Automatic annotation (TrEMBL), chain A:
Biological processes per GO annotation: carbohydrate metabolic process; N-glycan processing
Pfam families per record: Gal_mutarotas_2 (PF13802), Glyco_hydro_31_2nd (PF01055), Glyco_hydro_31_3rd (PF21365)
Keywords: Disulfide bond, Endoplasmic reticulum, Glycoprotein, Glycosidase, Golgi apparatus, Hydrolase, Phosphoprotein, Signal
GO cellular component: glucosidase II complex; Golgi apparatus; melanosome
Domain of life: Eukaryota
EC number: 3.2.1.207
Organism: Mus musculus (Mouse)
Protein name, entry field: Neutral alpha-glucosidase AB
SUBUNIT field: Heterodimer of a catalytic alpha subunit (GANAB) and a beta subunit (PRKCSH). Binds glycosylated PTPRC.
Matching InterPro entries: Gal_mutarotase_sf_dom, GH, Glyco_hydro_31_AS, Glyco_hydro_31_C, Glyco_hydro_31_CS, Glyco_hydro_31_N_dom, Glyco_hydro_31_TIM, Glyco_hydro_b
Positions of disulphide bridges: C9-C15, C542-C553
Main location per the UniProt record: endoplasmic reticulum
Length: 853, 87
C-alpha cells in the first residue's frame, strides 16, 4: 500500500486540532437554571467557559435500557448535519425524573429505575448507573470539543488537492470512560485484530470509506466501510457505543480498577451518541437492532457458493464455467460478471460482441437453476451517447461542485460523474432503472453487485470525492461521506424488489457500508491478497462486522490479488465454506482458478468443502432468520457464547456459527494439526467427522490432513442438514432433512428450523413459512411449532435422525398426529455411541415425537 | 400360498427387504437399492434414451428440476416437464 496517499491524523487538520486537546479540566459547564425536563428529553444549556459559546444538551432515556446524548449549537449560523435514514424509527423514549439535586449536580431516574443519570454542572460530566453501580462516564477526561460555526482550519490542501472549506472548523468530539472494561471490539472496517488495540503510541482508528489499493494487515487505516459502533465486554457486563455521525471520524482507545477510555472525533455534524447498557451482549444486539434494524433475510441461493472473477470474457465462457461445475460434480448457485461485461464500463449495458444475447445466457442459467450477478457501479461515464448519463444530467441528479456544475472525476470508464444518492429523487430514479424494461437484457435470475461506492474517484483526494462537493439540500460531501455507499446499496436493493412488483427478496453485494447496511444485503472485505495471513484475517474482520449487525460478510476466496498456491486455495475454500458470504473472486491478471483446474487431490478437498456448505444450508438459513428477527449475529466470537471465560476474549482463529458449531479452519501451510480450544464448564463437543466426544474446557490438539476442516458440534444442540447435495440450492429446497442431535451430558438438546419458499417476502406478507422447534429430553425427540402463525405447503420430510452420545435402544417408536404409532429401524455404533434412526418419513410441517425404548 | 424373496446389494454387504428398493431412502453402501430415486449419494440413474444412445447420470440429478436425459425420464416428479429431444 502507498500510505502517503492517505492522511494520517496529523495530516487531517480537524484530527490534529482535536487530538492536541489532552485529558484535563473541561471548560464546558451546564447552566442548571436552563434545565427543562420535557416530554421526550431533558434539555439544558452548556457554555464554554472561555469562549462563551452556548450549546444545547438533549438527554434522553430510551426504552430497552438505552440513553441518547445529542449536543448542538444553541444559535447556529447554519444548521448542522443530523444523520438521516440510518435509524429505522424514532426511538421510543422513557420518562426522565429529577430524583436528586445539588448546587453542582442533578440526578435523573429513567422511568422507575434502576437506571440513573447524574449530570454534573461544573465541569460538565455525565455518569450512567444501574442502581448505584457506575456503568459509564461521559467527558470524564474533559476531552469534549465542539467547534462552533464561525462567520489548515479553513482553506486546506493535501498533496495536489484543495478543500475550499467554506464553513471553517466545525469538528466535534467527546470521550467515554468504561470502568471494568479491558476488551473493546467493533468500528469496522480495519484489517486488524478482533480485539481493538490502544491507540496511544500511534494512530487512532479511522472511519472514512476509502478505496485502499493493496491494503496491508494489522494497521488502523480506514478501509471501504465504516460502522461507528464499539462494544465493550467484561466478565460482569456488556456495553455498546453508537456514534451516529456520517463524517470522517477518528477513534482513540486508551487503557488505565481496569478501565478503557474511548474518544470519537468527527469533522462535522452534531454530537449524537447512543449508550446501549446491556447487561448481556445479546441485550446490546437487541438494543442496536431496535435502532438500525436487522439483517435482511437473504434469498436462499445467495447463501450457496458464488463463482466469480475479473472477468469471464463472454457468454460462452460463462456457460463453460456453468458446465464445468456439473462435469466435475461441484455445486454452485451464482456466476458473477465483473466490469468487462458492460459496454466500456457504461453500467446497465452489455458488450455488443461478447454479451450480445444476455436474455439467452440467463435462460440457459435458469435451466440449470442457477443465478447471475452483474456489477453496477455508481459512477456514470460522461458520454452524450450514454442514456443514463444524459437523463441524470438533464434532471440535475449529479453531485455538484460549488460553482453549480456537475462534479466530474475519473474512474473505470474514464471521466465520470457521480449521482447524488443522498437525494431521494436520485434513489427513486436508480430503483426504477432496474425494471426489466429499463435494464434491457436483465431477468429475474440476475442480481446486482455495487462496487466502488465509497465513492472511489481515481483522481480525487485519498481516491475519493472532494470534501467541498455539494449534495441535496446544500450539504457538503464532508457531511455525508460515510452513508453515500449505504444509499447506493439501499437504492439498488429497492430496485430489485420493485422490478418484481414487490414480491422477490433482493440480493446486493456492496463494498462500502455504514450503520444500517445490514438491511440491504451483503458486504465483503474488498481487495485482499492470496497470502496465508490474509486468509487468517478474514475471521476477525468478519467477526468485527458481525458484532455490529452486518452478518452477511465474507472475503474473496483465494485472495483477490496474486495467484494462490493450490494448498492455500484448498484452505481458503474450507474457510469460506463456513463463512456467511461465500464467493471466490480474482484479479484481472491472475491465472484461472475455477476449482476443477487443480490436481485431483486438491479438487477432492474443495468438492468436500462445497458439499459440507450445501448440506448445512438449512442451518445457515435458520441462523439468518434468527438474525433477521432478533438481530443476533450468525458468525460469533467465542466470547459471545462464553462471556465469563476470559481466555476467549481475544480468540480470532476460531469462531462459532450460532450456538451449535465451533470452527477452527487450518490456516497454515503444511500444518500437521491445530490447537482447538473447546470452552464451557461441563460442556461436551462432538468432532462432526469422527463423532469423538470431548469435554470442555480444554485445548485439543487435532491432527489434520489436506481435506480436514476442524468442526465441532456443541452438546445440547440439533443441526438440520440436506444430505442430498445437488448442483444448486434451488434443486435442493424441497428435499428431506436429516437432524443431527448432539446430546448434552444431561441427555438433552434443542434446535430450530426455518423454511419458506426461498426467495419471496411471502414469509412476512402471508405468513407462509415454518418455524419448527426440535427438542430432546429423556429418551424422546419432539418436533413442535416455534411460531404458530407460520404455515407452508412443502414436501420436505424428515428422512433421517443422527444422535451423538446415545446408547443402543431396545425399540424406536414414532408418533405423529393423524398417523398410527410407527416403529423405526435403527443402527447403533457402540464405539462412537452414534444412533441413526432410519427414515422417520414424517412431514416437516407435522408435530411428531420419536421415543427410544 | 407361497411368498417372495428379498434384495441384496450388488456389493454383497447387506440384504434388505424388497419394499426398500426405490423407497427414497438409501440402504446400500453402493447405492444399488435406489436406481430410480435421488436417495443415494453414490447411485446412478439410467436414461434408456430409446431414440439415441443410453446414458447414466448421478442420482443427485433425479428430479432436480433440470433436464439431464434427452428422453426426460430423470424428471418425473419435480415440476419441470422435460421434452424428448434425443433427435
Ligand atoms: N477493485 C474493485 C474493482 C474490480 O477490480 C473490478 O470492478 C473488482 O474485481 C474488485 O472486486 C473491486 O474491489
Ligand atoms: Ca432403500
Ligand atoms: Ca435432472
Amino acid at each position: 500500500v502507498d500510505r502517503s496517499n492517505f492522511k494520517t491524523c496529523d495530516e487531517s487538520s480537524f484530527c490534529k486540532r482535536q487530538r492536541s486537546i489532552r485529558p484535563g479540566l473541561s471548560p464546558y459547564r451546564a447552566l442548571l437554571d436552563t434545565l427543562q425536563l420535557g416530554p421526550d428529553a431533558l434539555t439544558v444549556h452548556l457554555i464554554h467557559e472561555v469562549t462563551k459559546v452556548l450549546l444545547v444538551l438533549e438527554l434522553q432515556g430510551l426504552q430497552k435500557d438505552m440513553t441518547r446524548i445529542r449536543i448542538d449549537e444553541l444559535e447556529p449560523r447554519r444548521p448542522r448535519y443530523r444523520v438521516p435514514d440510518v435509524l429505522v424509527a424514532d426511538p421510543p423514549t422513557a420518562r426522565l425524573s429529577v430524583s436528586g439535586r445539588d448546587d453542582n449536580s442533578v440526578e435523573l431516574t429513567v422511568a422507575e429505575g434502576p437506571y440513573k443519570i447524574i449530570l454534573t454542572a461544573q465541569p460538565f460530566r455525565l455518569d450512567l448507573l444501574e442502581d448505584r453501580s457506575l456503568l459509564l462516564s461521559v467527558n470524564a477526561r474533559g476531552l469534549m470539543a465542539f467547534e462552533h460555526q464561525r462567520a489548515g482550519a479553513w482553506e486546506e490542501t493535501f498533496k495536489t488537492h484543495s478543500d475550499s472549506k467554506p464553513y471553517g472548523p466545525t469538528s466535534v468530539g467527546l470521550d467515554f470512560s468504561l470502568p471494568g472494561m479491558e476488551h473493546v471490539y467493533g468500528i469496522p472496517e480495519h484489517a486488524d485484530s478482533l480485539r481493538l488495540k490502544v491507540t496511544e503510541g500511534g494512530e487512532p482508528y479511522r472511519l472514512y470509506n476509502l478505496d485502499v489499493f493493496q491494503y496491508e494487515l494489522n494497521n488502523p487505516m480506514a478501509l471501504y466501510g465504516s460502522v461507528p459502533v464499539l462494544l465493550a465486554h467484561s466478565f460482569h457486563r456488556d456495553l455498546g457505543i453508537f456514534w451516529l455521525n456520517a463524517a470522517e471520524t477518528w477513534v482513540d482507545i486508551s487503557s488505565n480498577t481496569p478501565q478503557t477510555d474511548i474518544r470519537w472525533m468527527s469533522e462535522s455534524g452534531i454530537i449524537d451518541v447512543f449508550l446501549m447498557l446491556g447487561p448481556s451482549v445479546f441485550d446490546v444486539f437487541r438494543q442496536y437492532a431496535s435502532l438500525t434494524g436487522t439483517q435482511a433475510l437473504p434469498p436462499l441461493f445467495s447463501l450457496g457458493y458464488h463463482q466469480s472473477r475479473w472477468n469471464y470474457r463472454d457468454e460462452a465462457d460463462v456457460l463453460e464455467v456453468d458446465q464445468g461445475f456439473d462435469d466435475h460434480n461441484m455445486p454452485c448457485d451464482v456466476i458473477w460478471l465483473d466490469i468487462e461485461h458492460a459496454d466500456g464500463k457504461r453500467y446497465f449495458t452489455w458488450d455488443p460482441t461478447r454479451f450480445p444475447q444476455p436474455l439467452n445466457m440467463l435462460e440457459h442459467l435458469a435451466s440449470k437453476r442457477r443465478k447471475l450477478v452483474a456489477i453496477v457501479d455508481p459512477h456514470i461515464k460522461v458520454d452524450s451517447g450514454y442514456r443514463v448519463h444524459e437523463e441524470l444530467r438533464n434532471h440535475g441528479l449529479y453531485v455538484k461542485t460549488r460553482d453549480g456544475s456537475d462534479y466530474e472525476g475519473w474512474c473505470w470508464p474514464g471521466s465520470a460523474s457521480y449521482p447524488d444518492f443522498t437525494n431521494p429523487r436520485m434513489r427513486a430514479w436508480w430503483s426504477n432503472m432496474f425494471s426489466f424494461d429499463n435494464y434491457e437484457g436483465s431477468a429475474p435470475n440476475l442480481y446486482v453487485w455495487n462496487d466502488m461506492n465509497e465513492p472511489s474517484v481515481f483522481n480525487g483526494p485519498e481516491v475519493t470525492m472532494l470534501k467541498d462537493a455539494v449534495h441535496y439540500g446544500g450539504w457538503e460531501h464532508r457531511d455525508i461521506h460515510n452513508i453515500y455507499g449505504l444509499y447506493v446499496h439501499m437504492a439498488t436493493a429497492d430496485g430489485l424488489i420493485q422490478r418484481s412488483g414487490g414480491i422477490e427478496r433482493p440480493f446486493v453485494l456492496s463494498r462500502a457500508f455504514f450503520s444500517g447496511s445490514q438491511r440491504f444485503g451483503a458486504v465483503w472485505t474488498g481487495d485482499n491478497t492470496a497470502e496465508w495471513d490474509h486468509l487468517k484475517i478474514s475471521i476477525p474482520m468478519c467477526l468485527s462486522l458481525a458484532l455490529v449487525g452486518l452478518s452477511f460478510c465474507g472475503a474473496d476466496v483465494g485472495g483477490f490479488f496474486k495467484n494462490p498456491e493450490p494448498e492455500l486455495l484448498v484452505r481458503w475454500y474450507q474457510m469460506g465454506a463456513y463463512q456467511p458470504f461465500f464467493r471466490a473472486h480474482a484479479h484481472l491478471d491472475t491465472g484461472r482458478r475455477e476449482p476443477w483446474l487443480l490436481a485431483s487431490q486438491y479438487q477432492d478437498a474443495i468438492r468436500d468443502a462445497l458439499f459440507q456448505r450445501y448440506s448445512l444450508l438449512p442451518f445457515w438459513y435458520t441462523l439468518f432468520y434468527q438474525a433477521h428477527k432478533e438481530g443476533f449475529p450468525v458468525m460469533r466470537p467465542l466470547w459471545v457464547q462464553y462471556p465469563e471465560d476470559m481466555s476467549t476474549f481475544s480468540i480470532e482463529d476460531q469462531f462459532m456459527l450460532g450456538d451449535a458449531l465451533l470452527i477452527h479452519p487450518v490456516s497454515d501451510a503444511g500444518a500437521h494439526g491445530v490447537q482447538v480450544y473447546l470452552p464451557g464448564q461441563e460442556e461436551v463437543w462432538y468432532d462432526i467427522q469422527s463423532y469423538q466426544k470431548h469435554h470442555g474446557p480444554q485445548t485439543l490438539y487435532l491432527p489434520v490432513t489436506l481435506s480436514s476442516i476442524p468442526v465441532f458440534q456443541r452438546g445440547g444442540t440439533i443441526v438440520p442438514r440436506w444430505m442430498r447435495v445437488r448442483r444448486s440450492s434451488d434443486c435442493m429446497k424441497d428435499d428431506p432433512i436429516t437432524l443431527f442431535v448432539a446430546l448434552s451430558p444431561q441427555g438433552t438438546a434443542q434446535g430450530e428450523l426455518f423454511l419458506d419458499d426461498g426467495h419471496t417476502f411471502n414469509y412476512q406478507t402471508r405468513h407462509e413459512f415454518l418455524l419448527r422447534r426440535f427438542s430432546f429430553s429423556g429418551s424422546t425427540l419432539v418436533s413442535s411449532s416455534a411460531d404458530p402463525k407460520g404455515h407452508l405447503e412443502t414436501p420436505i420430510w424428515i428422512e433421517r435422525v443422527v444422535i451423538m452420545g446415545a446408547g443402543k435402544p431396545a425399540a424406536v417408536v414414532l408418533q405423529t398426529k393423524g398417523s398410527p404409532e410407527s416403529r423405526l429401524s435403527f443402527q447403533h455404533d457402540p464405539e462412537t455411541s452414534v444412533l441413526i434412526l432410519r427414515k422417520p418419513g414424517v412431514s416437516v410441517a407435522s408435530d411428531w415425537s420419536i421415543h427410544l425404548r | 400360498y407361497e411368498e417372495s424373496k428379498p434384495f441384496t446389494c450388488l456389493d454383497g454387504t447387506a440384504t434388505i427387504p424388497f419394499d426398500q428398493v426405490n423407497d427414497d431412502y438409501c440402504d446400500c453402501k453402493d447405492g444399488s437399492d435406489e436406481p430410480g430415486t435421488a436417495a443415494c449419494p453414490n447411485g446412478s440413474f439410467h436414461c434408456t434414451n430409446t431414440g439415441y444412445k443410453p446414458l447414466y447420470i448421478l442420482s443427485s440429478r433425479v428430479n432436480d428440476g433440470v433436464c439431464d436425459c434427452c428422453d426426460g425420464t430423470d424428471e418425473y416428479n419435480s415440476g419441470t416437464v422435460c421434452e424428448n429431444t434425443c433427435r
